[PDB]
Scaffold this active site. Structure first.
Site: not given
Ligand SMILES: *[C@@H]1O[C@H](CO)[C@@H](O[C@@H]2O[C@H](CO)[C@@H](O[C@@H]3O[C@H](CO)[C@@H](O)[C@H](O)[C@@H]3O)[C@H](O)[C@H]2NC(C)=O)[C@H](O)[C@H]1NC(C)=O
Ligand SMILES: *[C@@H]1O[C@H](CO)[C@@H](O[C@@H]2O[C@H](CO)[C@@H](O)[C@H](O)[C@H]2NC(C)=O)[C@H](O)[C@H]1NC(C)=O
Ligand SMILES: *[C@@H]1O[C@H](CO)[C@@H](O)[C@H](O)[C@H]1NC(C)=O
Ligand SMILES: *[C@@H]1O[C@H](CO)[C@@H](O)[C@H](O)[C@H]1NC(C)=O
Ligand SMILES: *[C@@H]1O[C@H](CO)[C@@H](O)[C@H](O)[C@H]1NC(C)=O
Ligand SMILES: *[C@@H]1O[C@H](CO)[C@@H](O)[C@H](O)[C@H]1NC(C)=O
Ligand SMILES: [Zn+2]
Lengths: 593, 196
Positions: A358, A488
């Site tokens: 991150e 998705h």
């Protein structure tokens, strides 16, 4: 007087301003929500999303009034193209009125989907928290099968009509925006123009995907053989030593990641796997220390250190104040030099690694902040998560683990735990590559109208068997819409990123681990302390979307396109072991049941 | 004689917006420039033409104190010979500037949650400012042939935009107060001095 390009430069100078100001307000709103859940803050986040949308649509129309063919500085051309190439909302308000509701309808189904145990019809379970567990932790062929079929039925058969309409409308929107189908539109994200041979045409993406997958197939085949064989010992009476793998018997509700077949496929079970979590616990590490070690990593390669806003405004540990919070790792760029990370970090090796991932994002964010607003993003949809993964690969090497002080200095890298580790890697990284390539190929063909609806699922599984080596537990007619049973797909997201991202990283890693003069297996390099790596990397992270993604790549890896060779290298130890282990077995899958 | 009112300038309660930069004349008086270069609050203290510490022994015919609020990353724009929207459209110093530039971070006062959009800046202008020129127009900038009927429209922008100063912002996008001291070396009588 003043050319179309000059007027448009001014136009962009104004948009950037109103854009970054209103984005920063949206971003602060969303922060206040994700980090403190209240009906009020939920409302305010929606309000700001409304103002943001309004702004972007108006500006996109205005942008289309500056004819691109008269703009000639490729940097400006890229910005204008991004601004005016937004028309998913460019047709009858009725189309957008309800044909956005079908989109909403789809997500709600997926989000509220519930399937009941036929043995205990009273016990109906949701996907998110009650079935995903079964599909990850269960070894009961019948249990796994009732979950798989229940989902694909209750939900997929409902989503079938919706998806059909979704296709005709999305194709209309595409045709409207001068794109052949929703497929061409999505493959736009890879289109690039500029300089000589640094340009990229949407019609090449298909080629390069296929070409590179061609080169991965051997590797996958062997992983498949090996997983099959081990699975035979868990599920005998169900798996043919020469056929495909039953879809419910894999790691999850789809065969997306074979990650949770490790207990069933571990190469040498006696040898345990490096789990620094106990080290961190004993050393009384905390969240701040994880992130401080991350910061050091990046500093040691020559990247900057985290801003002070970063430390002051980030959610780095689930709140005790009572606030309800979304516990999912995210890395924020709130558009004014405000960078943050929202993570309910815990003292565990995984969290350690993902903190490096991150912060990799934040570092990219910080590096391209010198670019105009519309160019402040990774070269394409793959680059960001590629960079994040690079970080997590270096951070986890036993070398790096020692230097940090989490291993015991005298740690030994037996070729057996190396194999265990490389297998687990393969089970997530390699396994998803076939699945990902197939799923987008099915969608692309459907949008191109090469799969008539009468043969939708008939090709879906046909292709599953040929490419993924997976077969359907029970047979499915065209009343099903199995592909829509994925967040998705039913939630309208590109999936090819996940494939390209993967090929991109290993290229990166082989390039930066090559600058650190690292010697030995690539799977064992830590770019730490290497400023040459740092520069090689930073000199592209700054570019953002400002140059064609081909150029960015070349600047790092030395090549203009996907090359699977670094990936293959990263696994070459595992590859040889696998080839032996499957010497007296069949590799490949008879396409049929 | 008497002491110069540098206080009222630097420690002023309300500060101006760069496009409407404020100017104050330094009348017959003497000031201790040291109390300035002996304070650690100052983020940027760059002196052009003159020697920082020797000022306490020098004399100048006039002194002008211009003050405005700007963005961190824009402080580099308030220096002799610079491009940018601040240095071209809001406050330009002459290439032969002979004075000092002082600036400090001011998140503590000028930024508020939700943002203090009161400070503003000129985004567009038909021609660059001249040294020490000031422009407080509010006329629609006409970029193209189409005349802007005093309303904002296609190729017709309102020239002034607002800084949004939220305390969570980044240093470079954080509010910084700036005082520019212009020293006049003229053949005229020198009424601004230090320790003689
Ligand atoms: C990257 O660079 C850092 C900085 O050199 C490396 O960390 C350092 O590693 C060495 C080797 O273990 C440490 O030296 C040790 O020093 C102590 C006394 O301070 C001594 O008792 C030991 O016998 C040994 O000589 C060193 O302390 C340590 N940290 C610092 C701040 O110097 C790191 O290993 C390098 N590589 C990687 C992959 O990070
Ligand atoms: C973290 O960053 C701060 C400033 O962002 C660093 O303080 C700077 O340190 C470097 C190296 O000694 C100098 O070049 C600068 O002059 C220092 N100050 C400023 C204002 O830039 C600090 O050293 C960094 N620390 C780490 C561990 O990365
Ligand atoms: C969370 O939002 C509520 C909105 O009602 C607000 O009152 C509260 O102060 C917020 N929590 C914080 C700021 O910690
Ligand atoms: C394009 O425009 C920008 C405007 O700032 C400029 O820096 C650049 O040199 C121009 N030319 C090219 C080839 O990018
Ligand atoms: C599987 O089991 C673990 C504990 O053994 C649990 O935390 C997890 O939620 C379960 N489901 C998964 C990983 O999908
Ligand atoms: C502003 O006040 C501080 C102390 O409050 C002082 O040190 C500084 O010199 C003052 N500024 C002037 C006199 O210009
Ligand atoms: Zn991420």
């Amino acid at each position: 007087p003043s050319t179309i390009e000059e007027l448009a430069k001014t136009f962009l100078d104004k948009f950037n301003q109103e854009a970054e100001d209103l984005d920063h307000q949206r971003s602060l709103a969303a922060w206040n929500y994700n980090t403190n859940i209240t009906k009020e803050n939920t409302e305010k986040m929606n309000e700001a999303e409304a103002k943001w949308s309004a702004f972007y649509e108006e500006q996109s129309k205005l942008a289309k009034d500056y004819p691109l063919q008269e703009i000639q500085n490729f940097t400006l051309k890229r910005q204008l193209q991004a601004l005016q190439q937004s028309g998913s909302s460019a047709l009858s308000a009725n189309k957008r009125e309800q044909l956005n509701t079908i989109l909403n309808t789809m997500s709600t189904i997926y989000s509220t989907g519930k399937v009941c145990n036929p043995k205990k019809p009273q016990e109906c379970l949701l996907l998110e928290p009650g079935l995903d567990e079964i599909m990850a932790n269960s070894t009961d062929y019948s249990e796994r099968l009732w979950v798989w079929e229940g989902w694909r039925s209750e939900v997929g058969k409902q989503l079938r009509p919706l998806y059909e309409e979704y296709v005709v409308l999305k194709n209309e929107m595409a045709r409207a925006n001068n794109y052949e189908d929703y497929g061409d539109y999505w493959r736009g994200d890879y289109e690039a123009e500029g300089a000589d041979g640094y340009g990229y045409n949407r019609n090449q993406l298909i080629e390069d995907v296929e070409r590179t997958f061609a080169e991965i197939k051997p590797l996958y085949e062997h992983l498949h053989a090996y997983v099959r064989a081990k699975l035979m010992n868990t599920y005998p009476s169900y798996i043919s030593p020469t056929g495909c793998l039953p879809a419910h018997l894999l790691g999850d509700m789809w065969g997306r990641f074979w990650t949770n077949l490790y207990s069933l496929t571990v190469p040498f079970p006696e040898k345990p796997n490096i789990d620094v979590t106990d080290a961190m616990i004993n050393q009384n590490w905390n969240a701040v220390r994880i992130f401080k070690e991350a910061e050091k990593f990046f500093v040691s390669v020559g990247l900057p250190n985290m801003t002070q806003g970063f430390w002051e405004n980030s959610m780095l540990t689930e709140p005790t104040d009572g606030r309800k919070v979304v516990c999912h790792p995210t890395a924020w760029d709130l558009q004014k030099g405000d960078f943050r990370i929202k993570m309910c970090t815990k003292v565990t090796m995984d969290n350690f690694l993902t903190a490096h991932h991150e912060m990799g994002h934040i570092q990219y964010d910080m590096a391209y902040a010198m670019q105009p607003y519309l160019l402040r993003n990774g070269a394409n949809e793959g680059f960001h998560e590629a960079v994040g993964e690079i970080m997590s690969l270096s951070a986890s090497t036993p070398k790096h683990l020692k230097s940090i002080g989490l291993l015991p200095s005298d740690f030994r890298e037996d070729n057996e735990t190396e194999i265990n580790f490389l297998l687990k890697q393969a089970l997530t990284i390699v396994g998803t590559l076939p699945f990902t390539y197939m799923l987008e190929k099915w969608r692309w063909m459907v949008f191109k109208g090469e799969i008539p609806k009468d043969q939708w699922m008939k090709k879906w599984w046909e292709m599953k068997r040929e490419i993924v080596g997976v077969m359907e537990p029970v047979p499915h007619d065209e009343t099903y819409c199995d592909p829509a049973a994925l967040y998705h797909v039913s939630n309208d997201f590109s999936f090819i990123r996940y494939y390209t991202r993967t090929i991109y990283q290993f290229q990166f890693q082989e390039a930066l681990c090559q600058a650190a003069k690292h010697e030995g297996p690539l799977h064992k390099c830590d770019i730490s302390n290497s400023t040459e790596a740092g520069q090689k990397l930073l000199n592209m992270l700054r570019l953002g979307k400002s140059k064609p993604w081909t150029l960015a790549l070349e600047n790092v890896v030395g090549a203009r396109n996907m090359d699977v060779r670094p990936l293959l290298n990263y696994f070459e130890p595992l590859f040889g072991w696998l080839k032996d282990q499957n010497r007296n077995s069949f590799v490949g899958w008879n396409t049929d049941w | 004689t008497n002491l110069c009112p540098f206080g009222e300038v630097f420690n002023a309660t309300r500060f101006a917006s760069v496009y409407a930069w404020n100017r104050k004349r330094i009348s017959n008086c003497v000031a201790d420039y040291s109390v300035l270069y002996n304070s650690t609050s100052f983020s940027t203290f760059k002196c052009y033409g003159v020697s920082p510490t020797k000022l306490n022994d020098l004399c100048f015919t006039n002194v002008y104190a211009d003050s405005f609020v700007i963005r961190g990353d824009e402080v580099r724009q308030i220096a002799p010979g610079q491009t940018g929207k601040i240095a071209d459209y809001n406050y330009k110093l002459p290439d032969d500037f002979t004075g000092c530039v002082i600036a400090w971070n001011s998140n503590n006062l000028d930024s508020k949650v939700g943002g203090n959009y009161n400070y503003l800046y000129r985004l567009f202008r038909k021609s660059n400012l001249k040294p020490f020129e000031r422009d407080i127009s509010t006329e629609i900038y006409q970029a193209g042939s189409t005349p802007c009927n005093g309303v904002e429209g296609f190729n017709c922008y309102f020239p002034l935009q607002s800084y949004g100063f939220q305390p969570t912002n980044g240093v470079g996008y954080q509010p910084y107060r700036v005082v520019v001291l212009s020293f006049e070396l003229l053949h005229a009588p020198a009424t601004v001095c230090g320790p003689h």
